[PDB]
Amino acid sequence: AVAAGA
């Protein structure tokens, strides 16, 4: 699982 941002 990879999450980027805001």
| Lookup: tokens for 3 | 């999450």
| Lookup: tokens for 2 | 């990879």
Which position has the token pair 């999450």?
A: 3
How many helices (H) and strands (E) would you count in the chain? 0, 0
| Lookup: tokens for 1 | 């699982």
d(CA 4, CA 2): 7
| Lookup: tokens for 4 | 């980027």
This entry's atomic model was obtained through electron diffraction
d(CA 1, CA 3): 7
Inter-residue long-range contacts of 1-6, CB under 8 Å, 24+ positions, other chains counted? none
